[PDB]
Structure 1
Amino acid sequence: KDQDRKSRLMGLEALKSHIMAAKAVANTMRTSLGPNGLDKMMVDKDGDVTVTNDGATILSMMDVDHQIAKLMVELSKSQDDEIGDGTTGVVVLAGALLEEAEQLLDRGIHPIRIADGY
């Protein structure tokens, strides 16, 4: 039920919209990568203020409605049990693979074929 007012995104534009939503998270954390990376301002729902450059802490405090953006956050729980430091470097690397994949979709290459190349 509830077929009316159902948000649907399909076609080739659906992939380019998912990449754009993923690049929004990667472009945010790429400035905080490294020891000289700039910090981020956090305003809690209760009014608290904290400042940290830690990437794993940022992803936990970011509230994103988009579904693909939520998948990027779930990756932090898996990496923190291993590295816990360069977690930002994985999000930046994930955003670079999708950004260069946008140029390949214009050439007509199938997405599964692109994933096999990586």
Structure 2
Amino acid sequence: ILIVTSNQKTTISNDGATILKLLDVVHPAAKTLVDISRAQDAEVGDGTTS
């Protein structure tokens, strides 16, 4: 997934975490997926997408 934020910073990633982050999610219920990705990424670091 190729994402470019407002500051024109190019990034290419397949990780739940990076992708979700490079995305400022304002919806409240959708940020639960952001939390478990960072929680899975902080401890284990693999299978975030899963």
Residue matched to 1:80: 41
User: Which has a greater percent of strand?
Assistant: 2
Aligned length: 50
**Residue ranges of structure 2 left out of the alignment (5+ in a row):** none
Report the TM-score when normalising by structure 1.
Answer: 0.38
Larger helix fraction of residues? 1
Percent identical residues: 48
Runs (4+) of structure 1 exceeding 4 A deviation are none
The TM-score normalised by the length of structure 2 is: 0.74
Unaligned runs of 5+ in 1: 1-39, 90-118
Q: CA deviation at 1:77?
A: 2.2
Q: CA RMSD of the aligned region, Å?
A: 1.4
CA contact (8 A) 2:20 2:34 kept: yes
Larger Cα-atom Rg: 1
Aligned to 1:48: 9
